[PDB]
Each structure stands twice: as structure tokens, then as C-alpha cells.
Design a protein around this nucleic acid. Structure first.
Ligand SMILES: [Mg+2]
Ligand SMILES: [Mg+2]
Ligand SMILES: [Mg+2]
Ligand SMILES: [Mg+2]
Ligand SMILES: [Mg+2]
Ligand SMILES: [Mg+2]
Ligand SMILES: [Mg+2]
Ligand SMILES: [Mg+2]
Ligand SMILES: [Mg+2]
Ligand SMILES: [Mg+2]
Ligand SMILES: [Mg+2]
Ligand SMILES: [Mg+2]
Ligand SMILES: [Mg+2]
Ligand SMILES: [Mg+2]
Ligand SMILES: [Mg+2]
Ligand SMILES: [Mg+2]
Ligand SMILES: [Mg+2]
Ligand SMILES: [Mg+2]
Ligand SMILES: [Mg+2]
Ligand SMILES: [Mg+2]
Ligand SMILES: [Mg+2]
Ligand SMILES: [Mg+2]
Ligand SMILES: [Mg+2]
Ligand SMILES: [Mg+2]
Ligand SMILES: [Mg+2]
Ligand SMILES: [Mg+2]
Ligand SMILES: [Mg+2]
Ligand SMILES: [Mg+2]
Ligand SMILES: [Mg+2]
Ligand SMILES: [Mg+2]
Ligand SMILES: [Mg+2]
Ligand SMILES: [Mg+2]
Ligand SMILES: [Mg+2]
Ligand SMILES: [Mg+2]
Ligand SMILES: [Mg+2]
Ligand SMILES: [Mg+2]
Ligand SMILES: [Mg+2]
Ligand SMILES: [Mg+2]
Ligand SMILES: [Mg+2]
Ligand SMILES: [Mg+2]
Ligand SMILES: [Mg+2]
Ligand SMILES: [Mg+2]
Ligand SMILES: [Mg+2]
Ligand SMILES: [Mg+2]
Ligand SMILES: [Mg+2]
Ligand SMILES: [Zn+2]
Lengths: 86, 27, 122, 158, 52, 134, 50
RNA sequence: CGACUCUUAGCGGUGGAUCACUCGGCUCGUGCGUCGAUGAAGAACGCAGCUAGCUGCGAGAAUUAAUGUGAAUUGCAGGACACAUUGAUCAUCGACACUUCGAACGCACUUGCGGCCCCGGGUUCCUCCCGGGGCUACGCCUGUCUGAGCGUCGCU
RNA sequence: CGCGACCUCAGAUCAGACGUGGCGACCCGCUGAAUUUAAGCAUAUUAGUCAGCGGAGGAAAAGAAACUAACCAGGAUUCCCUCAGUAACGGCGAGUGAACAGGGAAGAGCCCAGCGCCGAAUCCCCGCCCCGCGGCGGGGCGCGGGAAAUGUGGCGUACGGA
RNA sequence: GGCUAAAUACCGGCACGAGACCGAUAGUCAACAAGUACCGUAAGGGAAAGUUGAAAAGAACUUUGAAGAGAGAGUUCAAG
RNA sequence: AGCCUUGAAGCCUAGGGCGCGGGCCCGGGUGGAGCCGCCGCAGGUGCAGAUCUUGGUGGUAGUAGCAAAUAUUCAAACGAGAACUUUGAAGGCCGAAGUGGAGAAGGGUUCCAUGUGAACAGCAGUUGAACAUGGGUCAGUCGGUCCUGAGAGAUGGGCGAG
């Protein structure tokens, strides 16, 4: 009865999609995420999982502002200028 | 214009079940 | 007619917003032609008009921003958009004058004991 | 288990020593970095000696070494006062000055005074204003025959 | 909104509107049934704009 | 040998910088020699092949003395299509057989207002090297 | 259920629009390897997480 | 003779070893050594004529402007493009733009309720109602403003 | 009662700033094991190591002696060779374990409070004038406002200094 | 009580060069739409998968069969 | 001054032989681009096992089986094709605590229409919850939204290396 019989009672979910990390680990009762600790300001990450870090690091996403900072760097972040016109 | 086939995935089953119902007690 | 960004810079704000409000109607009529079924000559003009609208709104925002940073050209406080945006640590430095500042004790040491240029005989 | 005959040797490898291993594969790639910055410096100081300021003559402590002579850190303010060089102007003509040194003996105090005389005599000074010579300044005939001395200046030989 | 829709068909098409009934499709887009005033004829304002 | 410490003598890096090269670089990569009648006129050994140029194939199955107009430059495949170098598919329709620009010699350039700049550039930098030598 | 939320109806809508086969004109391309769509999903076998 | 069985060879299948390739890794070295409230990293959702993923981008959405280049992109359409009253395509990238969540900032997290100020319809300042824009997080520094005290006083 | 100071303390969507979170190979501050070794095990060892928390920079930290020495004396810090598997620690078992000197890479020093001297001789802020203007400054005005005598600036710091 | 570059460290980042290294069960888990597909409520776990040919020239057309499938024919130096 | 598109590696071989052996050399075939002899150098260097690892394949075997809940039959149509689809006629079951008619959680397009017969639906299918094309969920009054319940949770304060 601890097995196939009591696998039917599973109908109300514990977690939902966290809004900070988009993973299905937001404990609805504890009101905190198990993947990033969303209500806490600091993203949670431990060294004892060398691999769970490589899934969420500055390279894993779009870097929509870093891939441009890395380009504006090759010229000391010049500003307010344009090439000489034709 | 060469048409194409199809493809459907499915979870890979892992064999780990062990009933271990049989008992041979002989002290 | 090929709408280039060069001949858009002399026109006036309302002579630009009338072109915008005409291109958006040409879009609406093309997104309608797409669903009613139209010739590819029309369907392919969507990429042409979406980019004509892009060129127009680009010249509008560029002239408006140039006018803004001219209006605040000599003022002390200006909008955080017109303030020079570099890296946070590069904006939180010391000025070139605070860097180039010296105490009266070191403006006196540098003066009384300058680094002399010399050589030695071998 | 020990063999028949040998040493009782204690290997100090009971810590995670493979993590903190330091390999010297960049030793040839840093000898060139040091030599390059050593010639960028010997080109930044154009006629000034390439080794740097002159160092004093200095006995060593520790009876193991108290018969060799060495090159110290700077000329004690006593030796600068005897040689007649202001302690704040010495550092601008390549004379080394550390105030911590005492002078208990005299045979070394006079050796370092004779050393400053032998340096303040070989010193070719360039005028602060180029287009106008000055009073305490070598004449324009030297400055054209003024070169950059390599190696240590007035090297110290036992 | 149903208000923005009403006031945005009364600008692009110049047709007074009776009521608006929106619903978000499983596709994701928001279908909107706009019911025209009694005198205005849908079949003849869709005839104009193209869909017919 | 090559002594520039910043150029890549590696194999797989030139075989990767080649195939993943941008189009404007694939234009230089797809250069082609000039015929010895335009060489003694312009003092230029090769030119990036353009579309409307007259060319003549020298290596392959379609090598001969027939001259043809370059019909299109398919720079993504690193190939070109010439006027009358073609083939018949099974059904009958004809397809253009691609030729590499390096195996084909140009006999009449299509002089633009820019191919004149490129020619006078090459000629200039060639006479500067001749005065550099003589 | 039938008492969805908006964030979920929208995530199901995305999961509906990702569930269609590759256009047939797309493996006549030049630099091509995709024989078919392998990221497909059937509502019966694989259960969308959630 | 016939069947079946065993062995060897021939060819044929199942399978994908071996070899030959390699736009991938591993390691060593060099140069620089730069994120964020001016909204980072990450996530979500969107954008292609035909588009699912990858990639690119953000309602200006497989990219706008500028400059260099100088004739293509291509899977098919279609469409630009005297190549010079003017510039297809790539690369560069300094101008402009950059949806929602996120340190995430009006209060909450359903996408819900607000308050203030200024515009536009509504009105004709009549508050209503609708649309648009700007504001409204916590600590903290310098000064301003308004205050509290049978705190210490001085004079009425 | 009121008025006016000062001190202490609140309130602002007050004017103008600042912090927060990410990365983390290297670095700084704390916290801190147990596998294992000892042919058992408890002190020791593993190890001030793994995990944990906080904070940075392109390097960080350290740094111009309340030092080493016992010499005929050396003279900031950091780094390498060497000292040295040494002195020493240790159920003196297992094991652990530096420094000084010396040769090198580099090389650089300084600054306050205090004690005194000077009419606060000092500093921040707003308004206007001209420039500079894409690292918010220079010069001039303001019986303009503040900070500060419960101490600002100049000389001056142990090598002595006035 | 306070400041202070250089020599020094760097399995993260950008951009590079190299090798007595491996050569698709190896080398990173990942040469490929890989931290993807998939599993787990979660923390986490996590693959398999490179090669037609020089060029698609990727077999028109005839034929039996409903079709898959064949038999001819043709492409190629070669469909062995 | 090695071998090679006048055919390298690899693999197959009732072919000729060498060596005690490890092994090797020739011939024929297949294949299509690289390979070896010698003197030294280096090593992730030789497999029959490890209830070895990964992949592939056999005998078992056309075998076990495709047996819980009473039951099917006739004619016609579509179709290449019918025990299984559709219509009609019989006979039967469920027998209002249903095999009926509607909802909550959960699923997420499974809904509806047309077509397809490759794979799947443990026989077959002309059928399907399969596949491919397209459609479809309309609110002042139905719910959410609001209020509190058990309880969760800021500020003040306290504690805390954090
Ligand atoms: Mg619960
Ligand atoms: Mg952290
Ligand atoms: Mg002072
Ligand atoms: Mg023995
Ligand atoms: Mg022995
Ligand atoms: Mg299920
Ligand atoms: Mg056989
Ligand atoms: Mg799309
Ligand atoms: Mg452009
Ligand atoms: Mg251009
Ligand atoms: Mg709620
Ligand atoms: Mg304010
Ligand atoms: Mg033990
Ligand atoms: Mg033991
Ligand atoms: Mg034990
Ligand atoms: Mg212990
Ligand atoms: Mg740690
Ligand atoms: Mg931080
Ligand atoms: Mg930094
Ligand atoms: Mg420091
Ligand atoms: Mg020392
Ligand atoms: Mg020894
Ligand atoms: Mg210890
Ligand atoms: Mg020492
Ligand atoms: Mg030296
Ligand atoms: Mg003072
Ligand atoms: Mg001191
Ligand atoms: Mg310090
Ligand atoms: Mg080399
Ligand atoms: Mg493989
Ligand atoms: Mg292989
Ligand atoms: Mg692998
Ligand atoms: Mg394989
Ligand atoms: Mg193969
Ligand atoms: Mg062959
Ligand atoms: Mg055999
Ligand atoms: Mg090896
Ligand atoms: Mg074996
Ligand atoms: Mg049977
Ligand atoms: Mg029912
Ligand atoms: Mg029903
Ligand atoms: Mg159905
Ligand atoms: Mg079946
Ligand atoms: Mg009604
Ligand atoms: Mg609490
Ligand atoms: Zn989360």
C-alpha cells in the first residue's frame, strides 16, 4: 500500500516556477525557492556542488550587457564621438 | 521537394527493481 | 521609394511624424494583406516598411537627443541619460583635477628637491 | 614495512600536496619579462646609471661572514653630513640614503666618505634649464660625452 | 483593454463601437470580438479594409 | 618560414578561419588570376572575382578555350557559376556546375568606379615594391 | 486544470508553439544537419514538468 | 540419394570494429585584466515572407544610425541595388533604442490594488470616466525646511 | 505666558550624492571538521585543510622596525636559491617543523595627532558673469548661506624640529 | 595613529600563440539543436549522437503492385 | 635521392613460404590516400577471465504467452483489402451507490473538422486520445480579485563573526 496504491494520491503540488530563476522549485508553503532562495537578496550557491554552479554563471545566459562591455573595453569606453563623416 | 519522415522520443528505462521476496532461513 | 536616413535629417518633427503615421498605416494594410492572402510582392514589403519605420524613429530619437544634450550643454546637473555612461567604477573615480591635486607640502618638496638628470663616468 | 637496511626517512607528503604544486614552466617566460622591463627602465632613465643609486660599503654581521664586504642600502646621515651632502638632495643625484644606519667604527665611516667623494667627483650633472647652464653643473663639454653606465656603479670588490 | 481597443478602432477605422469581448487564445494572442453600433454595418466596414 | 608571432601557422585554425570567414573576406579568398593580356596592361596578378566578368576555365572537366560570362558568385559555397558550364539533371533541366575561382582565369574585367580603384591600388603598391627592390 | 493562471496559460502557449515539425524547405539548406525535429513532445508520454 | 546436423569456402544479410580523416578537446605560455540603482548576472515572454531548435535581437525585436568595404543574400520566392544626387552584402560599432521578473525600488505577487503631478479625449475646472507621460522602495552622507523636550540657559 | 539662543532628538516624494546584487582562478578577515595515518585508540596527524560566512583589486595583503643581532655589526615590505628536513615540537610514537645570516629579482619613501606659532590665516553649498565644456573644473563677483574655536589651514614628526 | 608603486600570485574573463598530448567507447559531460533530450516534487542527476560524392550530378522515363517494395533505364571512375 | 592514384592504410583469403616462438614476408581480392625499413628517443604500449566497462548478437523460441468482470449474430455500404470501421435489424450487459449526465485537483490541445495509413494503439484496422493540416475557450451578474481563520511575515527592538 506504500507503493502503487499510494502513488495515486499525488494531486497537489509542492513547488512552482520561481520568478527569479525560472526553475520549478518555489516551495509554495515555505514561500522560498530551493534553487536560488528567491526571497533572500543573495543568490544561494555552495561550493560542494562544483557542477550546479556551471549551470548558472555569467556565461550561461545572454550577457546582453557584458558582451557589449567586453567590446567597448577595447577602446577605453569612448563616448560622445562618431567616426569622421564621409 | 523530397518529403520527410518523423520521430518520437521516450524516457529511457532503468533496470533496478529487486523484489527480494524469497527467504531461505536455515540457522 | 528607398527611404534613406540622409534625407530625413533636414525634415521637421511633424514632417517626420506624418511619415511615421503613414508608414504605420502601410503596415496595417500589409499585415491585413498577409492574412487575406496577397502577392509576394506585397508580403516582402513588410521587411521594407518595418525598417522604414525603424529609420524614421531612429532619426526622430537622434535629433531629439542631440537637441536635449545641446539644451543641457553648459548646465551643471543634467539627466542621467545625458550624463556620460561608463562603467560604474569608472564613474566613481576622482576627477583629473583631484588626481592632479597636491598638498602645499609636496608642492614645496617637488620644488626644493627636483629629480636631477645626470650621468656617471665609467 | 622497512626493507633490510636503509634510512629512516620521513616524507612530508601527508597533506594534500598535489593541490599546492608550483611548477616553473613560466621561468623562461618571466626571465624575458624582467629583462624587457629592465631595458624599458634603462631607456626611461636615459643617461642615469642602469643599476640605480650608488650603494655604500658594508661589513656583514655574524662571524661566519664578518670578513667579507658588501653593498649596503644607503649612506648613513653621518656619512652624508661628513661628505657635505644634504640628506634630501642626495636622493636626487643617485646617492642612496637610509637613516637607520649607525656608524660605530671610523675605518668604515671614512671609507664611505671617500666613497662619496669618489662618486661626487665622477658625477656628470646636467643643468636644470637645458638652454641655460647653472653654477653647480658640469659644463656642456661633458654632457655630450656623458654615457649610461651599465652594471653596479663603483662596484664593491673584496 | 476593452477601452483601448474601442478607442483604437474608433481611430484607425472611424466606426462607433457597441461592445468589445476579449479572450486570450491558447496560442497566446488576445482575440477580440468588436460589435459595431446598430447603424454601422460590419460586413461593409470589413469590405472596406479588405477582409471579405 | 613565417616569423610573425601573431599569425597562426596551425592547421585547424586556418581551416576554421577559412570556412567560418565573413562574406567580405570570402571575397578576397575567392580571388582569381588575370590573363596574361590584362597582366601586361594593368600590372596586376589577381583580382577578387565579380559577377559580370568574362572568364575561362583551365582545370577540371570543363577546361578549354571557350570563354564565358560569370553568371553568379555563390560566395557561401566558395564557388562561381559561369555562363555555359552546366549539366543535365535526370529529368532534363539544366544546372550550373560550380567552379572554384582559383581554377579559372579572367579575360575581361567589368570595370566599375571601384575596380578601377582596386587596380590602381595594386599597381601602385607594386611599383613601390619595384622601387623598393631596384 | 481549468482554473489556470496567466503565467501558466502563457507558458503552455509557448509549449504549444514549440511543438511543430521543422519546415520541409529547411533541410534543402546548405549547411544543414537537422533531419527532423527531435525536441518534440507528446502530451501523454512526457508531462511538461510543472 | 532425401531431411537435419557439423566443418571449410563463395556470395548475401545483422552489426559497425579497424584504418584514414577532424571548424573538438587537454595542457603550457603571453598580453590585458573591464560588471551593477545611468538597473548587473540570470530567468520569462516575444520578433523572420515561408521558422520548430540553435543563433541574433527587444514592439525600432534574425536588427536602426554611422564608418570601412564595394556587389550580393540564397533553401524557394519576392525585393532592393545608374555602384556617382549615390551603395546590395559583410565587418567594425563611437549615435539612438533596449518588453516583464530579477539587488528590483509605490503595496503585493494573482498580474491584484493604490496615492500625487502634468497632458489628451470626457468635460468645457464638474467632479466624474478613459487614454498618455512623470513620480511614490530601504539604509545612509552634506546642507535646507518644519518641529519636540519639568535638557542647559538669557530677556521679558 | 511669550520670546531668542544652544544641546539632544524626530519628520520629509526636502536639493544633491552614496551603498545594496553578480563573478570568484588568484587575494583579505573569521568559522572549521571527519574520512585517513598511528598496523587498535583517546593527545597528536590529516589540518588551520574540505565545507560555511563576510570583503575587495587587477593584483590583494604586507611595508619604512617598540627589527635582526652579539659582528670589524646589519637596516621597510614581497619574491627566489640556500640555511633545512635544520633548531625545535611530539603517547619524544606516528610524525610535524621555522627563523637569522648569505647570493639574488625589485628598490622609494613618507604623512598625522600631540607640543608651539600665526587676527580661522581653512573648508563645503547656492545665485549671477565669461570660458572649459563626453573624467564637472578655472578665473570674477555676492553686508549670499553654512561647517568650524568641543579646533580648520600653513610650518612641523623622532632621520630631531621651532 | 595613517598612507605608499616595483619585484610576487591567477584551473574566472576578453584576445592570442604553441605542443614528442587524445583522435569520436579517446580528448572536456558536451567535435553534433549539450548542461540539450530525459529522470526526480525538489536539492540535483544527466546522456547517446561526426564521415554519400569532386560536384547532388540525390535515379528522368517504362513496368507489376493499393502502397511499401521491386525489374529495367540513367548519373558517377565507382551505387561493389 | 625509401614506397604510393600504373593504387597507401585497413580488412578477407581451400594461394606460396620463413622463423622453436613472439611474429613476418609474398600472391589474389576489396578499398580509395596516405605508409613504412634502419640507428637512436619517449610511453596512457600487447588481454580470456576481474558476478570487468560500453556496444552488438545467439540457443532458449516461433516457445511462454496475447484466459478477472456472461455475448455475440445477419445483411448492406465505403474500400485493393473487413471477425474488429459505419448504417440498419436481432439478441445481451450496465440496471439510477450505473459502463449514465455534470464538476474540483491534476493533464495541456487530449477538444472539433478534413485527410494519411510510415511508426504506435502487444491480432487486424477503411478506425484512434496516432500522424499532418486547419479551426476553437467571448461575462458588471460564474469564479478569481476582496476579508479574515489556523498560520506565514517586515519595520521598532534584541541577538548575531557573519
Ligand atoms: Mg505541503
Ligand atoms: Mg554568496
Ligand atoms: Mg601638514
Ligand atoms: Mg619484502
Ligand atoms: Mg634496500
Ligand atoms: Mg501519466
Ligand atoms: Mg556461408
Ligand atoms: Mg517564431
Ligand atoms: Mg544600416
Ligand atoms: Mg554602408
Ligand atoms: Mg492571492
Ligand atoms: Mg529628493
Ligand atoms: Mg588507526
Ligand atoms: Mg588499518
Ligand atoms: Mg577504527
Ligand atoms: Mg586529534
Ligand atoms: Mg573553503
Ligand atoms: Mg559585494
Ligand atoms: Mg574590478
Ligand atoms: Mg595595498
Ligand atoms: Mg630580512
Ligand atoms: Mg644538508
Ligand atoms: Mg601543523
Ligand atoms: Mg635574510
Ligand atoms: Mg639587483
Ligand atoms: Mg594643528
Ligand atoms: Mg619611525
Ligand atoms: Mg596598508
Ligand atoms: Mg615555440
Ligand atoms: Mg562518439
Ligand atoms: Mg570510429
Ligand atoms: Mg565522448
Ligand atoms: Mg560510435
Ligand atoms: Mg560510418
Ligand atoms: Mg570504389
Ligand atoms: Mg578463415
Ligand atoms: Mg601517448
Ligand atoms: Mg575480451
Ligand atoms: Mg502457444
Ligand atoms: Mg461519468
Ligand atoms: Mg460528458
Ligand atoms: Mg476526438
Ligand atoms: Mg498491432
Ligand atoms: Mg448581457
Ligand atoms: Mg522573521
Ligand atoms: Zn528560484
Amino acid at each position: 500500500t506504500k507503493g502503487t496504491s499510494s502513488f495515486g494520491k499525488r494531486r497537489n503540488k509542492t513547488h512552482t516556477l520561481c520568478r527569479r530563476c525560472g526553475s520549478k522549485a518555489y516551495h509554495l508553503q515555505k514561500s522560498t525557492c530551493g534553487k536560488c532562495g528567491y526571497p533572500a537578496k543573495r543568490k544561494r550557491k555552495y561550493n560542494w556542488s562544483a557542477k550546479a554552479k556551471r549551470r548558472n554563471t555569467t556565461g550561461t545566459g545572454r550577457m546582453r550587457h557584458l558582451k557589449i562591455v567586453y567590446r567597448r573595453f577595447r577602446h577605453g569606453f569612448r563616448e560622445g564621438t562618431t567616426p569622421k563623416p564621409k | 521537394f523530397v518529403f520527410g519522415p518523423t520521430g518520437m522520443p521516450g524516457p529511457t528505462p532503468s533496470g533496478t527493481n529487486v523484489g527480494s521476496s524469497g527467504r531461505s532461513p536455515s540457522v | 521609394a528607398k527611404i534613406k536616413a540622409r534625407d530625413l535629417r533636414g525634415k521637421k518633427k511633424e514632417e517626420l511624424l506624418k511619415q511615421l503615421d503613414d508608414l504605420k498605416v502601410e503596415l496595417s494594410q500589409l499585415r491585413v494583406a498577409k492574412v487575406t492572402g496577397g502577392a509576394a510582392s506585397k508580403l516582402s514589403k513588410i521587411r521594407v516598411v518595418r525598417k522604414s519605420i525603424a529609420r524614421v524613429l531612429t532619426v526622430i530619437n537622434q535629433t531629439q537627443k542631440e537637441n536635449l544634450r545641446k539644451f543641457y550643454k553648459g548646465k551643471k546637473y543634467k539627466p542621467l541619460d545625458l550624463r556620460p555612461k561608463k562603467t560604474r567604477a569608472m564613474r566613481r573615480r576622482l576627477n583629473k583635477h583631484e588626481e592632479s591635486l597636491k598638498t602645499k607640502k609636496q608642492q614645496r618638496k617637488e620644488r626644493l628637491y627636483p629629480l636631477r638628470k645626470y650621468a656617471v663616468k665609467a | 614495512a622497512p626493507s633490510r637496511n636503509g634510512m629512516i626517512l620521513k616524507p612530508h607528503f601527508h597533506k594534500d600536496w598535489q593541490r599546492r604544486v608550483a611548477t616553473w614552466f613560466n621561468q623562461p617566460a618571466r626571465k624575458i619579462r624582467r629583462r624587457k622591463a629592465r631595458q624599458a627602465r634603462a631607456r626611461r632613465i636615459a643617461p642615469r646609471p642602469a643599476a640605480g643609486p650608488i650603494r655604500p660599503i658594508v661589513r656583514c654581521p655574524t662571524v661566519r661572514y664578518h670578513t667579507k664586504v658588501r653593498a649596503g642600502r644607503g649612506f648613513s646621515l653621518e656619512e652624508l653630513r661628513v661628505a657635505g651632502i644634504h640628506k634630501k638632495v642626495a636622493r636626487t643625484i643617485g646617492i642612496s640614503v637610509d637613516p637607520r644606519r649607525r656608524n660605530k667604527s671610523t675605518e668604515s665611516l671614512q671609507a664611505n666618505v671617500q666613497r662619496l667623494k669618489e662618486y661626487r667627483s665622477k658625477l656628470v650633472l646636467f643643468p636644470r634649464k637645458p638652454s641655460a647652464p647653472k653654477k653647480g653643473d658640469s659644463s656642456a663639454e661633458e654632457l655630450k660625452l656623458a654615457t649610461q653606465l651599465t652594471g653596479p656603479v663603483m662596484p664593491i670588490r673584496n | 483593454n476593452k477601452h483601448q481597443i474601442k478607442q483604437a478602432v474608433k481611430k484607425l477605422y472611424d466606426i462607433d463601437v457597441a461592445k468589445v469581448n476579449t479572450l486570450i487564445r491558447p496560442d497566446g494572442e488576445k482575440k477580440a470580438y468588436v460589435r459595431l453600433a446598430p447603424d454601422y454595418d460590419a460586413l461593409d466596414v470589413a469590405n472596406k479594409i479588405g477582409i471579405i | 618560414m613565417k616569423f610573425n608571432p601573431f599569425v597562426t601557422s596551425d592547421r585547424s585554425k586556418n581551416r576554421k578561419r577559412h570556412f567560418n570567414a565573413p562574406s567580405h573576406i570570402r571575397r578576397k579568398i575567392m580571388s582569381s588570376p588575370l590573363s596574361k593580356e590584362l597582366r601586361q596592361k594593368y600590372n596586376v596578378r589577381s583580382m577578387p572575382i565579380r559577377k559580370d566578368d568574362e572568364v575561362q576555365v583551365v582545370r577540371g572537366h570543363y577546361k578549354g578555350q571557350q570563354i564565358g560570362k560569370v553568371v553568379q558568385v555563390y560566395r557561401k559555397k566558395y564557388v562561381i557559376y559561369i555562363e555555359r558550364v552546366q549539366r543535365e539533371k535526370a529529368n532534363g533541366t539544366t544546372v550550373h556546375v560550380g567552379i572554384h575561382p582559383s581554377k579559372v582565369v579572367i579575360t575581361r574585367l567589368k570595370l566599375d568606379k571601384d575596380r578601377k580603384k582596386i587596380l590602381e591600388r595594386k599597381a601602385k603598391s607594386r611599383q613601390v615594391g619595384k622601387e623598393k627592390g631596384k | 486544470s481549468s482554473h489556470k493562471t496567466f503565467r501558466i496559460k502563457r507558458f503552455l502557449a509557448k509549449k504549444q508553439k514549440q511543438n511543430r515539425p521543422i519546415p520541409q524547405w529547411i533541410w534543402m539548406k546548405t549547411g544543414n544537419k537537422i533531419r527532423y525535429n527531435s525536441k518534440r513532445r507528446h502530451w501523454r508520454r512526457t508531462k511538461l514538468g510543472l
